[model samples]
Target: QIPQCAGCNQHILDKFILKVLDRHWHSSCLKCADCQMQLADRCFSRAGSVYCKEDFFKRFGTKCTACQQGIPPTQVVRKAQDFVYHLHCFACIICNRQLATGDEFYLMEDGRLVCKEDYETAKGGTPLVAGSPIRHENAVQGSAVEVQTYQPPW
Candidate 1:
């Protein structure tokens, strides 16, 4: 028996059969359902429909924390805990300095980023003696400074 084409539901008489989504389709028939573009190389599938790269990401991609825009999987992104951001979007909240890959930074509990210098200045009002509590109440991690670095997620 001839294999049936998933798109047209007709007998596949072509020599090449593009098997995708666990179904058989003629190479020309395997297309993005949203834009009707043929998915010859790569495509994204959700539920039971196929979509092109741009449309798929626009509809179901992870949004950046700063810009609140969808981040394509092809672009490099920064992550701190559960939040994701574009490389340029990840910057110091106080001074607006872009935090590079090796820069030491801080992640506030309220979801803010701070460079080392800013963090020190913000919490450097007075020097404390031995056996004394931290003076900065809004310091990260509750009295202790929470320092971090930009680690690539790849």
Candidate 2:
């Protein structure tokens, strides 16, 4: 018995019938749901309906917050606290510095990233200063310094 085509529900007797979505189809019948393009080699499916590669992801894919564009699952993405962005888009809002995995970055309330220096400057503060390194020689000497008391004038 010949397999039935999913699109037309007719028995397939052609030399090459496409097998997709666990069902048989004619080469011209297997088409994208949105664009109606013929899917000969590859296709995407959702809710039992077939779609082309581009239209499949476009219809259902995560969106980047920075550019407001679709982010397909096949591509890498950068994620902050509650927002998602494309790898190149996750940067400091003021300086456009791309943040790395261990970089010190702040997520603003309005879903923007700010580097350490930029965050401080925007808050009306100067850049942070580093403290002097501890001297190991002083600790090794073990010398106790005496404090002078207040001397009263006679």
Candidate 3:
């Protein structure tokens, strides 16, 4: 029996068939049914539905944070609220592996927004920016670091 596209329920054409777990799925759906990211090679399967692998890995890869079994290269999506990361890249950051994606992980110091659990882990209690420059006894010192540049009320 021929398979069908998991997302649109269309016939599973040759160009959009992925054989895995004794089943087939449309490449588009397998990659990311919701967004159609063709560059993705891994995905999260839950209740017979697929989600973006990067997104799944970020949210729930602590058990095996460094499993780079089937990760892809390039192709990232930066949402307004949070940034998406490849499974392999996320693995590297949490476990100190070498499959990193080069600072692709979104890290905010303000503690206002954080998407992945790993990001929360990295956001320790310590302040984001630490250490004040020590001024020399005789060295000319510049104006104090501007907490907030001011403007005349007009």
Candidate 4:
């Protein structure tokens, strides 16, 4: 007897079979029940049905916005009542700056991590644009500040 495809309940006509959720599925037939995403790389089960990790966790747990990985309980995590972050993976998403306790940062409404500088410079947010940007942030003790302008090669 030929094995049946768990997804469609039809005879599996393939050389390879993927066993998941205690059921045998044809390579193409194995997919998330809710999202229809292909279960090619990794998958998890809930209530005897298949789901992609994103769907599985959204159903059962929370995920970190930065790394897009599950926040397993064994790992040390940071939370701000509404958001969660893995302690090591937590950082400013804009410049990849570390946003640890020492550094001040802001969380966007849509879940973007931003440093103080990037938050103002980003087009979506308010920016103080009147200042000359070519000025050096930290000048050398013995050197003079030069007015270096950008000459773009069009």
Candidate 5:
């Protein structure tokens, strides 16, 4: 039997099959109902509902940071920063140093924050500008590393 689109009930002929369940699914429903993201082949139904890869990780993957325990994905809150990390990862951005629960931290202009010590250390360190080639000293040990260095505008 041919499948039909979930949206318009049109016959589903596309290579991608939007499977909502083992037998019940509309061909047009290519995205997960929760996060509206395209579903990957490895997706599974949790609590009798289907979810995309990201949504599944967001719903099932746990804290996996501090205790490294399998806590519910929803409970593993992330910081407002761009990187998606477990709440515990926010304590020490430099290292995996866990901060005391409810402890306050410093936030930089770029949205990267860390403990006071880490923040000060980072500020004192040299800044990496664009177009900087990361040359390795060991590479020179072999044959006086090529001096073809190019410096970009500061």
Candidate 6:
């Protein structure tokens, strides 16, 4: 009997088939669903879809805003508005000062990150340039590529 590739939905002719979510796939079909990056030894999943770390967060949930990287489920992080960050990545871009929960921060129009004190003290207090529609919410989750919610405007 031949198994089917979850990706291409064709008969998996390869010698082996990877079983995921109770579904079989050809080795080549087990690629990241978002970026098409090949899944090597490891992969992430959400809502029954497989993806790479970066794409996982971009799709399903939160990723670090500062480093522009994905956070695994086992990692810690901070989130504000739609911007998510690894806890370490959520620091003052200027002085590298770490921010704790509820620590005040600011965002420039260009998407530069700054802490409250730094925003007030910088070069005669340079103000946030643009990108409005600001709202706040407490975030506590990792990223999923199959369902990314937010993206900073360029």
Model 6 off-target regions past 4 Å?
1-62, 123-154
Clashing pairs in 3: none
lDDT of each: 0.62, 0.63, 0.38, 0.56, 0.44, 0.60
What is the Cα-based lDDT of residue 133 in candidate 5?
19
Ranked by lDDT, the better of candidates 3 and 5 is 5
Lowest lDDT 10-residue stretch of candidate 2: 136-145
What residue runs in model 4 are displaced by over 4 Å at the alpha carbon? 1-59, 123-154
The TM-score of predicted model 4 comes to 0.38
Per-residue lDDT of candidate 4, residues 71-95 (tens digit): 6644555543345666665566778
| Better model by TM-score: candidate 1 vs candidate 4 | 1
Off by over 4 Å in 2: 1-59, 124-154
* Tens-place lDDT digits, model 5, residues 1-154: 5566444567755554455434323433545668776443444455656566555655564333334555443343444322233455545667656555454556555545466566666663222211211122111111111111123452
Residue by residue across 90-127, what tens digits does model 6's lDDT show? 66788898776656778665445787877778743233
Give lDDT: candidate 1, residue 26: 71
Quote the positional error of residue 48 for candidate 3 in Å: 4.8
TM-score of each prediction = 0.41, 0.42, 0.31, 0.38, 0.28, 0.40
Candidate 4 global Cα RMSD = 21.1
- Residue 59 miss distance in model 3 (angstroms): 2.5
Which pairs of residues collide in candidate 5? Answer: none
How many residue pairs of model 2 clash at the backbone?
0
